[PDB]
Amino acid sequence: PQFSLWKRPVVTAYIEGQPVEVLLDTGADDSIVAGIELGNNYSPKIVGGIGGFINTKEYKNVEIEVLNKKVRATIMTGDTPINIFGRNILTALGMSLNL
Amino acid sequence: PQFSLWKRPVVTAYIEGQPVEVLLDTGADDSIVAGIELGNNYSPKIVGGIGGFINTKEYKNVEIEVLNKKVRATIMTGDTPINIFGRNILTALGMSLNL
Ligand SMILES: CC(C)CN(C[C@@H](O)[C@H](Cc1ccccc1)NC(=O)O[C@H]1CO[C@H]2OCC[C@H]21)S(=O)(=O)c1ccc2c(c1)OCO2
Ligand SMILES: [Cl-]
Ligand SMILES: [Cl-]
Ligand SMILES: [Cl-]
Ligand SMILES: [Cl-]
Ligand SMILES: [Cl-]
Ligand SMILES: [Cl-]
Ligand SMILES: [Cl-]
Ligand SMILES: [Cl-]
Ligand SMILES: [Cl-]
Ligand code: NA
Ligand SMILES: [Zn+2]
Ligand SMILES: [Zn+2]
Ligand SMILES: [Zn+2]
Ligand SMILES: [Zn+2]
Ligand SMILES: [Zn+2]
Ligand SMILES: [Zn+2]
Ligand SMILES: [Zn+2]
Ligand SMILES: [Zn+2]
Ligand SMILES: [Zn+2]
Ligand SMILES: [Zn+2]
Ligand SMILES: [Zn+2]
């Protein structure tokens, strides 16, 4: 796949079977998703963005299906206005930014 | 150039001749930079992200030199914690995100 960036590079994905709209985000170290419920096996993590900080719940070894691939990766759940797949997942997928 | 995303894709840009380190960010619609003054001819607008919102000042037709190319693009100034070159600039440079 190739994303030419004239539109947002948004795709659908599944996280532990739960469907989401996600933004492929080279400006994010981590992957942050709102509204999904991954249960009680988490550690708290503090994440900073453009407007300040939020608490998140960090889940490791989560099954992710996106772009016809299946990977296991860390997902943080919390109050992001857009669900983002950051570089932890982009590298797991083998993605690159090119010019 | 290829950015493999194992590390943050950060490069040196010159904005109206001033050097700034910028994050190449596919998750950003717009480009936002701090620490530089671009003057009185702007439009104020609010942007949102993780943590909340910030006020920005939007400037059109700003001289940008980055990745050995020179372009004219829209830049916001505001109190962003990191300087961000979003899709408006990435597309002017001919960048793509690939799997
Ligand atoms: C949240 C996504 C949808 C939007 N953002 C760009 C992101 O790439 C942002 C860019 C960013 C990077 C660093 C600090 C602040 C923002 N990264 C970010 O929030 O990442 C967080 C998750 O992983 C961690 O690693 C980096 C911070 C954490 S943003 O910075 O808020 C932003 C930039 C340009 C914009 C905009 C919002 O609205 C219109 O134009
Ligand atoms: Cl397209
Ligand atoms: Cl596109
Ligand atoms: Cl398009
Ligand atoms: Cl599934
Ligand atoms: Cl933390
Ligand atoms: Cl963070
Ligand atoms: Cl905006
Ligand atoms: Cl010139
Ligand atoms: Cl490819
Ligand atoms: Na004016
Ligand atoms: Zn397009
Ligand atoms: Zn599945
Ligand atoms: Zn959408
Ligand atoms: Zn992190
Ligand atoms: Zn982080
Ligand atoms: Zn962690
Ligand atoms: Zn915008
Ligand atoms: Zn010049
Ligand atoms: Zn120069
Ligand atoms: Zn400040
Ligand atoms: Zn490929």
Side-chain angles (χ1 to χ4, degrees):
Chain A
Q2 164 166 224
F3 298 83
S4 286
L5 305 175
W6 297 103
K7 55 176 182 179
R8 295 182 169 168
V10 169
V11 297
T12 61
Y14 297 95
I15 304 172
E16 294 290 347
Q18 300 183 42
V20 287
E21 175 176 355
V22 304
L23 175 63
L24 304 181
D25 192 348
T26 59
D29 302 343
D30 306 300
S31 296
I32 321 299
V33 183
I36 61 168
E37 299 163 8
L38 293 175
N40 281 347
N41 298 322
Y42 64 85
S43 320
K45 296 291 163 153
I46 303 164
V47 170
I50 206 163
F53 295 93
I54 58 168
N55 285 339
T56 68
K57 296 177 185 181
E58 181 192 71
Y59 298 89
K60 292 188 352 114
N61 275 29
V62 182
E63 289 205 359
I64 301 135
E65 302 187 3
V66 67
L67 291 179
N68 288 324
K69 299 185 127 206
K70 197 160 11 147
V71 302
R72 283 187 105 102
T74 298
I75 291 292
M76 295 172 182
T77 65
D79 188 28
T80 180
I82 302 177
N83 302 326
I84 54 171
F85 279 179
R87 294 184 301 97
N88 72 304
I89 288 172
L90 305 184
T91 53
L93 296 168
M95 296 193 79
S96 61
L97 192 63
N98 296 91
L99 206 198
Chain B
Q2 178 161 299
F3 301 84
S4 70
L5 303 179
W6 291 101
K7 50 203 295 289
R8 293 181 176 182
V10 170
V11 299
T12 300
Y14 297 79
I15 305 176
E16 296 284 359
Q18 316 195 355
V20 302
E21 302 287 298
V22 300
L23 180 63
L24 310 172
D25 191 350
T26 59
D29 300 333
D30 308 300
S31 297
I32 317 174
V33 301
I36 169 189
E37 178 64 60
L38 292 177
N40 286 327
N41 289 319
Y42 63 85
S43 185
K45 56 215 245 121
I46 297 163
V47 310
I50 284 168
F53 304 92
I54 61 169
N55 284 325
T56 73
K57 297 174 175 165
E58 186 184 63
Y59 297 89
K60 298 252 250 270
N61 283 118
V62 184
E63 193 190 357
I64 297 145
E65 291 167 273
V66 69
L67 294 173
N68 301 309
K69 300 182 163 226
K70 170 186 61 38
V71 302
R72 290 267 178 195
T74 297
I75 292 289
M76 286 175 214
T77 65
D79 192 13
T80 176
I82 189 158
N83 302 321
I84 294 166
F85 276 12
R87 293 187 298 98
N88 69 304
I89 290 175
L90 305 182
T91 54
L93 301 167
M95 307 213 66
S96 45
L97 178 69
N98 294 278
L99 185 43

